Amino acid sequence: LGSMSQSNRELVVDFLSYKLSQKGYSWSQMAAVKQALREAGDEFELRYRRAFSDLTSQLHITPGTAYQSFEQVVNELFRDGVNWGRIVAFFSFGGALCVESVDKEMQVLVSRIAAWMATYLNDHLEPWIQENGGWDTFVELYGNN
Amino acid sequence: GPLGSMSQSNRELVVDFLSYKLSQKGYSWSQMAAVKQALREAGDEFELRYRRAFSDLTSQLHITPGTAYQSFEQVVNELFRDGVNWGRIVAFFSFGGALCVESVDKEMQVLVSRIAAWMATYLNDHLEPWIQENGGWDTFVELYG
Amino acid sequence: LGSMSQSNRELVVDFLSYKLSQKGYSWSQMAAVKQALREAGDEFELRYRRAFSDLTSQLHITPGTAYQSFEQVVNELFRDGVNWGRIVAFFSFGGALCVESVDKEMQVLVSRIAAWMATYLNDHLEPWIQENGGWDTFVELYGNN
Amino acid sequence: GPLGSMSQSNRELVVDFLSYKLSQKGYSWSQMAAVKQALREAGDEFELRYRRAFSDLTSQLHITPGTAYQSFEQVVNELFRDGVNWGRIVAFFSFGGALCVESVDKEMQVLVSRIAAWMATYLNDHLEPWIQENGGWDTFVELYG
Ligand SMILES: CCCN(C(=O)N[C@@H](CSCc1ccc(Br)cc1)C(=O)O)C(=O)c1cccc(C#Cc2ccc(F)cc2F)c1
Ligand SMILES: CCCN(C(=O)N[C@@H](CSCc1ccc(Br)cc1)C(=O)O)C(=O)c1cccc(C#Cc2ccc(F)cc2F)c1
Ligand SMILES: CCCN(C(=O)N[C@@H](CSCc1ccc(Br)cc1)C(=O)O)C(=O)c1cccc(C#Cc2ccc(F)cc2F)c1
Ligand SMILES: CCCN(C(=O)N[C@@H](CSCc1ccc(Br)cc1)C(=O)O)C(=O)c1cccc(C#Cc2ccc(F)cc2F)c1
């Protein structure tokens, strides 16, 4: 489904978000969390690139994977507990797995991964986030103002 | 999710993160994602190259608090005085971004969402038909990104 | 160009707009003007259906029509002056002409008509509107609260 | 144009008017327009048929001023307790519309934009993947409108 008058509005907000963040300003909390997370991810990938080779064959997540199985896989990443660094890792692994899915010509898995990750974030990680200083605490620790 | 302007969605944060990461590898979350990214990139290049033109824009372009859209439309018209093209449209985004940045600096953050709404308005009424007629943003992506 | 997370937000606002207006409430001024105009148009069409048969052959507006020629055609509708009733007529004639364009398998003309009508509204009619009580005066006279 | 939430575009008013008129003839401005229209229609039928269920919803569904999204998500979950389908999704829109209408009645117009944002949020996080997997809104249009 598409939306064309929103399209121009959407470009606007995205571009202004981008240019504000370059000066440490933020369109909104959501925009601040986005810049922060992108940045935290970049740094993460720079340091742990070694972990991102052949993720497909190791994580056992395919298009026909059930969310419960996805949940079991991610749970392994958080076996010794949830902390900010582990939450960044979660995003980075999702991202890398998407890229592989595109490399391997299974684009279909990308939107499956998005939806799985959103559910997991919703049910598992955001509640922890709310008990540990909230999304603003994420922005203080990883964002650029 | 974090508190946004129109929702506090977890999916929205995930989707932004995957879009970014897909783009770093030569891929796209979607056509919109690709447009957004090409436009950020084009804005960055424009602002560095024509850096000398980005001082006291709130004054040179007469955008103050209490400005009405008709005034804004009057100023932007001069930019497209000799016709629309993709360069002038990049200029339009960049100037509007620098205006917002200038606004926050001066503790006029109130201007920012107003500038957004004026830019979206101007696009819709003045720029859209030229854009469509010229192959759409799809063409922008192909010529730029 | 499409936009998918806005898509759900867009449905929301549209549906809530619709349900509010059914009780004489309005999401925004823009939403009030939309309900009012749709209604004014319905009434107009009911009374003057006789004027809407074979508009294509009489208005001389094709896909290759220049906006200046479009402007000349619409100007004829406003020859004896602009008033609210004539402004409603303008919308109704545009609408009917679009429908014929779809009947005659020239859909391409519809978006051309939208853009022409938006320019004409912008340059000719909205200024008159601003000197005659504004968009709220349109809502008082044609809307349902 | 009239003052909207995200812009004051003239095109936006035109486009809304032509969409309406195209739809009255069995046509569509676009896929989104068609979805919007089918959904309004489906909401109308649902609210008349299940009219008896639409009293004191602010109370039965505990949506008051100062309500947080987590609370809202908790209430809406019960509606989809036994699974998602297109009927339950129509119900979701209608109830949210009646809630907004109820809000304005009680001089709690402040709730309306908050309800919008919560509905958009819930759609994105909870309903989107089911919708996509089930053929998208394109399927809704084909089964309903
Ligand atoms: C094939 C194992 C992948 N992996 C690693 O390679 N870890 C590395 C450690 S170095 C990477 C690292 C660095 C810092 C932190 Br904090 C956590 C991890 C290793 O064991 O050598 C993992 O740590 C790991 C273990 C278990 C689950 C996952 C995952 C995942 C995942 C899948 C999908 C998705 F959408 C999101 C995800 F987080 C990731
Ligand atoms: C103070 C800036 C005035 N300005 C310039 O400095 N132009 C420069 C050219 S260098 C900038 C440039 C470079 C390439 C292109 Br294509 C277009 C412009 C000059 O001719 O010396 C403009 O190009 C100009 C002239 C008239 C109006 C505008 C504007 C604007 C504007 C205002 C608000 C907003 F949201 C967006 C806008 F684009 C911008
Ligand atoms: C082929 C003539 C169409 N037309 C009529 O048939 N008028 C009727 C009068 S009855 C319709 C009517 C009723 C009330 C009012 Br106020 C104004 C008109 C007639 O002369 O018998 C017009 O009045 C007319 C005359 C000149 C121009 C136009 C137009 C137009 C138009 C075209 C495109 C567009 F996007 C918007 C437009 F308004 C419409
Ligand atoms: C006070 C209404 C409670 N309610 C009912 O009356 N259900 C009725 C069924 S008749 C309504 C109906 C008819 C068909 C379908 Br499919 C689903 C519901 C009943 O079982 O007697 C619900 O269906 C119900 C139950 C639990 C939660 C909700 C809700 C909600 C809601 C809140 C906010 C919002 F923005 C959107 C929402 F959908 C609605």
Swiss-Prot record, chains A, C:
Indicate which residues form the motif BH1.
76-95
Q: Name one GO biological process term.
A: defense response to virus
Q: How is it modified after translation?
A: Proteolytically cleaved by caspases during apoptosis. The cleaved protein, lacking the BH4 motif, has pro-apoptotic activity.
Disulfide bonding pattern of the chain: none
Which stretch carries the motif BH4?
A: 7-27
Residue numbers of motif BH3? 33-47
Q: What is the effect of changing D123A?
A: No effect on caspase-1 cleavage
Name the residue ranges of motif: BH2: 127-142
Which GO molecular function terms does the record list? BH3 domain binding; channel activity; identical protein binding; protein kinase binding
Q: Which domain of life is it from?
A: Eukaryota
Query: What is this protein's tissue specificity according to the annotation?
Result: Bcl-X(S) is expressed at high levels in cells that undergo a high rate of turnover, such as developing lymphocytes. In contrast, Bcl-X(L) is found in tissues containing long-lived postmitotic cells, such as adult brain.
Q: Which UniProt keywords apply?
A: Apoptosis, Cytoplasm, Cytoplasmic vesicle, Cytoskeleton, Endocytosis, Membrane, Mitochondrion, Mitochondrion inner membrane, Mitochondrion outer membrane, Nucleus, Phosphoprotein, Synapse, Transmembrane, Transmembrane helix, Ubl conjugation
Q: What is the effect of changing D136A?
A: No effect on caspase-1 cleavage
GO CC list: Bcl-2 family protein complex; centrosome; cytoplasm; cytosol; endoplasmic reticulum; mitochondrial inner membrane; mitochondrial matrix; mitochondrial outer membrane
Give the record's subunit note. Homodimer. Interacts with BCL2L11. Interacts with BAD. Interacts with PGAM5. Interacts with HEBP2. Interacts with p53/TP53 and BBC3; interaction with BBC3 disrupts the interaction with p53/TP53. Interacts with ATP5F1A and ATP5F1B; the interactions mediate the association of isoform Bcl-X(L) with the mitochondrial membrane ATP synthase F(1)F(0) ATP synthase. Interacts with VDAC1. Interacts with BCL2L11 (via BH3). Interacts with RNF183. Interacts with GIMAP3/IAN4 and GIMAP5/IAN5.
Task: Share the domain note from the entry.
Answer: The BH4 motif is required for anti-apoptotic activity. The BH1 and BH2 motifs are required for both heterodimerization with other Bcl-2 family members and for repression of cell death. The loop between motifs BH4 and BH3 is required for the interaction with NLRP1.
The protein's job, in short, is: Potent inhibitor of cell death. Inhibits activation of caspases. Appears to regulate cell death by blocking the voltage-dependent anion channel (VDAC) by binding to it and preventing the release of the caspase activator, CYC1, from the mitochondrial membrane. Also acts as a regulator of G2 checkpoint and progression to cytokinesis during mitosis. Isoform Bcl-X(L) also regulates presynaptic plasticity, including neurotransmitter release and recovery, number of axonal mitochondria as well as size and number of synaptic vesicle clusters. During synaptic stimulation, increases ATP availability from mitochondria through regulation of mitochondrial membrane ATP synthase F(1)F(0) activity and regulates endocytic vesicle retrieval in hippocampal neurons through association with DMN1L and stimulation of its GTPase activity in synaptic vesicles.
State the similarity comment.
Belongs to the Bcl-2 family.
Q: What is this protein called?
A: Bcl-2-like protein 1
